[PDB]
Design a protein around this ligand. Structure first.
Ligand SMILES: N[C@@H](CCC(=O)N[C@@H](CS)C(=O)NCC(=O)O)C(=O)O
Ligand SMILES: N[C@@H](CCC(=O)N[C@@H](CS)C(=O)NCC(=O)O)C(=O)O
Ligand SMILES: CC/C=C\C[C@H]1C(=O)CC[C@@H]1CC(=O)O
Ligand SMILES: CC(C)[C@H](N)C(=O)O
Lengths: 214, 569, 214
């Protein structure tokens, strides 16, 4: 059994749990204390000391996109996250990185900041969301005909959409119901219905992170 | 940005680039749709190099019945994406009926571009053949006043409703239309029959510089001119005193006419002296605006017979035929509009879908496989199937079309058609005869007012507890609530079957709501449908709505000219 | 014929060039004036407007590391950059992510900024080249038993090594030698020996950058 060192509000951690559970893999979930990080995480990651990291075959694999690609690659016989063609796995990667960087910074300043960046970031969020709806054109999912790579990349950001609708104070549903409803399309599936923790609690911890630092 | 010459050569070479632009459009449409579930069931994934080969041989053809549940699943609370993707901002309907039940179809902003772009073209081909003044106006008997919200809290709507109050309508159509007569508020007036009256009044209002009259259909025109035919004495009077007729009751739009109105007595002397000299309103369309370059609208197919009563209205003024398309996907444009209605044909526009045709060539019908768009045979008739942004993939709409010629490398289509008809049986009934009889029974309470009932529709609403059916109505003129309330009772009192008797008397299904709608409503489901991309077999309107109906539905809620739940019961 | 949109001192453009030339493609380079980003680039990435951009079948392939796995997958028969196991792939990808974060930014600090910013960047890069040195351990390369994925990723920084040594007025070699040492080893590969411009010029571009913003 593979061991997951994760963080319950971590969306990237949510990437790993969604992927492994999206297949048919039985794995053990471990809560990390970032004040008291397990001997397992420091011996698995002595540098960034980051989650998520999964040990399989006595081997630690770290980074969310990297753990998930590792999942596709180690158990590829049922539900592939990738389409068969080079350019299309390339277009899941292109948008994986998009969700991962510019989109994840924009959202990070949504829940993590006050004033100027909060607002201009609300923009950014409305903008990046605006592009991702556009290229998807009309796909129920993302990375292939079923649950994909870039969809697991973004679905974890469903459990923060509601935090973003209070601190960013928008309704991306009433300016783009397209996206959260991928997310709720994707919520009919059990990798999302039992991996992504409760929406309210994310709001709680997002607001409480806001409480702890000024 | 709208211009004449540079857009059309792009299009000439677009029309000659016919095959790559659609194969590209198909491969666009696949690459934007690689995630579609039915395709997983079909075996697809991406680029390949037999993709068009893989497509026509691996993905099966489909019907309204089979498509209903998927786009149904999109709409009811599960905001979830299926045969398109993105839960679409709107859903559409198809004329005729899915074994008699309603069908659902996804709408994306792509369609709005489709609308705009082919019109950007379309105005350019007609203004080529009928050049227009850049400071004038047009009379548009057009409406988009209505917006319901579906059972899932999801917007699903007509081409109409979706185009005019779309955020992109105003900026986009501003450079390709002569400014509308009507302030948009009266266009989206909750009462489009009082809005019509004001609409005909609006185009009547800025006439001297008016370049054309328009409706999608010349029956939008002859019914507008049969509406016109029903209302201009009162039009003199309401306009004369600078006080509008007591016929109009809606205060937001009444505010719109009051910001416009003041007392002016000479002018009436005039209107009355013109329209008289005719022998019954032959060439009225140039009477109203002697300077309209044309009368624009679809004039082929299911309704060749009112081009003559409109020619009758239009006189010797040329009668110009409208381009083809729908919410399901647009097809073909008359890039030579100067052509007569009977000989009028329309050329396909390239990136709005990927198109295929089933031949009728054998007897009836024919077990042969579809051939490509440039592979179609001249003079011969094929039925169109559609692959596009509207959630339709090699979809059999069910309509037979004739090929008349080629505009460079792109073909020109003809429609001798009318009804896409074979039916089957259902569950939105309450026998169609019963529902027609319901309207008939209750509507003669309105007939006491020198009124007839022009058309009707319905809706099953099972979000509410208990659920209630919603009966819909297009009448020829305005009246008061008491009689309409009475009318709803009679619709309840007219479904004559033993069954729903147990139902509503037990109220396990809650009271019928009659939302009476305003004029042009069922005219717009029509105006939607002949233009629809297929063939002219597009006119049997579905009469009662399961949760799977869409074109009549956005129409239903916001033009509640009135809405009532039965006081009996 | 593969059309690459490149920029003479792009370590990232070099990632693409080294990747492709390492594989066995004959391709064409076009030099960019980022003041006038080309019609076909502005069509390739109309928002980032960023290179390297390799164009194949008329489909723009973007982002450097995205582009090099593109290289792997476009011609999968001769020169693989990854080894056969999913684990090793994840480690190489892991370490490629390493090259891209604190390492890139720290170098950006050592030649691009000064003073309070500078030494922060200086301790950061010596730290980086040290974890680096530790994981290079012994191996001729990084991402497999031969010339690898991330070999491509981080070799292209070794012509900037000169600019780092001079503005830093350092010597990143007596603190961590096996690294630069591995780098001029990696210079013998015809993929990097002909894709990378001269360092006096690169130094000089850092000098132009510096002279502009003081
Ligand atoms: N980009 C890396 C870094 C992730 C990261 O920084 N994660 C946060 C939690 S989501 C964390 O673990 N921070 C460690 C800390 O607070 O020092 C990844 O996605 O794994
Ligand atoms: N993450 C990028 C790094 C590229 C980068 O920084 N590119 C610079 C080259 S100097 C660039 O193209 N900047 C675009 C601009 O500012 O115009 C990639 O690998 O594509
Ligand atoms: C393209 C503009 C969208 C609106 C379309 C409607 C009109 O403006 C007239 C009909 C047309 C629909 C049709 O051709 O089917
Ligand atoms: C009016 C137009 C947008 C469309 N054909 C409809 O009637 O729905």
């Amino acid at each position: 059994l593979p061991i997951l060192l994760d963080y319950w509000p971590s969306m990237f951690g949510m990437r790993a749990r969604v992927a492994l559970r999206e297949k048919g893999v039985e794995f053990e979930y471990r809560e990390e204390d970032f004040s008291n990080k397990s001997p397992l995480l420091l011996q698995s990651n002595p540098i960034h000391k980051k989650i998520p990291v999964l040990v399989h075959n006595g081997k630690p694999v770290c980074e969310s996109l990297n753990v998930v690609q590792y999942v596709d690659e180690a158990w590829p016989e049922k539900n592939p996250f990738f389409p068969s063609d080079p350019y299309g796995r390339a277009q899941a990667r292109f948008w994986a990185d998009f969700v991962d960087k510019k989109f994840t910074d924009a959202q990070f300043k949504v829940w993590g900041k006050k004033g100027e960046e909060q607002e201009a970031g609300k923009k950014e969020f409305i903008e990046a969301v605006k592009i991702l709806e556009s290229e998807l054109g009309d796909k129920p999912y993302f990375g292939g005909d079923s649950f994909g790579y870039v969809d697991i990349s973004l679905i974890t950001f469903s459990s923060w959409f509601q935090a973003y609708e209070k601190f960013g104070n928008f309704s991306i549903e009433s300016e783009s119901p397209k996206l959260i409803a991928w997310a709720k399309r994707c919520m009919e599936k059990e990798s999302v219905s039992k991996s992504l923790p409760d929406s309210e609690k994310i709001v709680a911890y997002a607001a409480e992170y806001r409480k702890n630092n000024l | 940005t709208f211009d004449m010459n540079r857009v059309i050569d792009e299009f000439d070479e677009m029309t000659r680039n016919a095959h790559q632009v659609q194969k590209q459009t198909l491969k666009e449409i696949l690459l934007k749709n690689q995630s579609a579930i039915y395709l997983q069931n079909c075996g697809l994934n991406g680029n390949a190099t037999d993709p068009e080969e893989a497509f026509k041989s691996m993905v099966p053809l489909v019907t309204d019945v089979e498509l209903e549940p998927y786009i149904k699943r999109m709409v009811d609370g599960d905001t979830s994406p299926i045969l398109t993707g993105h839960p679409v901002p709107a859903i559409s309907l198809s004329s005729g009926t899915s074994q008699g039940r309603p069908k659902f179809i996804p709408f994306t902003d792509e369609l709005m571009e489709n609308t705009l772009q082919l019109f950007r073209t379309a105005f350019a081909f007609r203004n080529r053949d009928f050049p227009i003044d850049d400071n004038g106006k047009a009379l548009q008997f057009i409406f988009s006043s209505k917006q319901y919200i579906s059972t899932g809290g999801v917007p699903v709507g007509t081409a109409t409703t979706n185009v005019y109050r779309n955020p992109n309508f105003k900026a986009g159509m501003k450079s390709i239309t002569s400014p509308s007569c009507s302030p948009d508020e009266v266009i989206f007036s909750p009462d489009v029959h009082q809005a019509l009256y004001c609409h005909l009044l609006s185009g009547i209002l800025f006439r001297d510089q008016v370049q054309y009259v328009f409706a999608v259909f010349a029956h939008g025109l002859v019914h507008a001119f049969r509406t016109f035919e029903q209302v201009w004495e009162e039009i003199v009077t309401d306009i004369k005193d600078g006080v509008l007729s007591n016929r109009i009751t809606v205060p937001s739009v009444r505010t719109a006419m009051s910001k416009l109105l003041t007392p002016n007595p000479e002018l009436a002397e005039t209107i009355r002296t013109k329209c008289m000299s005719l022998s019954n309103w032959y060439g009225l369309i140039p009477a109203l605006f002697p300077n309209a370059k044309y009368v624009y609208g679809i004039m082929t197919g299911s309704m060749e017979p009112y081009v003559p009563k409109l020619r009758h209205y239009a006189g010797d003024l040329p009668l110009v035929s409208h381009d083809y398309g729908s919410s399901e996907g647009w097809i073909a444009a008359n890039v030579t509009p100067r052509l007569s209605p009977e000989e009028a044909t329309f050329a396909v526009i390239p990136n709005l879908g990927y198109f295929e045709f089933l031949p009728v060539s054998e007897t009836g019908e024919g077990e042969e496989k579809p051939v490509g768009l440039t592979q179609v045979k001249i003079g011969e008739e094929y039925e169109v199937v559609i692959t596009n942004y509207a959630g339709l993939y090699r979809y059999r709409l069910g309509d037979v079309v004739k090929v008349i010629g080629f505009y460079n490398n792109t073909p020109q289509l003809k429609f001798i058609c009318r009804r896409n008809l074979i039916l089957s049986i259902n569950i939105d009934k309450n026998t169609e005869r019963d529902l027609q009889l319901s309207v008939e029974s209750a509507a003669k309470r309105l007939s006491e007012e020198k009124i007839e009932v022009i058309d009707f529709s319905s809706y099953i609403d099972v979000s509410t507890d208990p659920g209630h059916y919603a009966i819909f109505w297009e009448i020829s003129g305005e009246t008061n609530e008491d009689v309409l309330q009475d009318c709803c009772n009679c619709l309840d009192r007219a479904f004559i079957d033993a069954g729903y008797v147990s139902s509503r008397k037990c109220k396990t299904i809650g009271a019928l709501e009659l939302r009476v709608v305003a004029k042009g409503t069922f005219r717009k489901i029509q105006e939607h449908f002949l233009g629809l991309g297929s063939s002219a077999g597009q006119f049997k309107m579905p009469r009662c709505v399961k949760p799977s109906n869409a074109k009549v539905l956005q129409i239903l809620c916001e033009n509640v000219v009135s809405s009532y739940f039965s006081t009996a019961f």
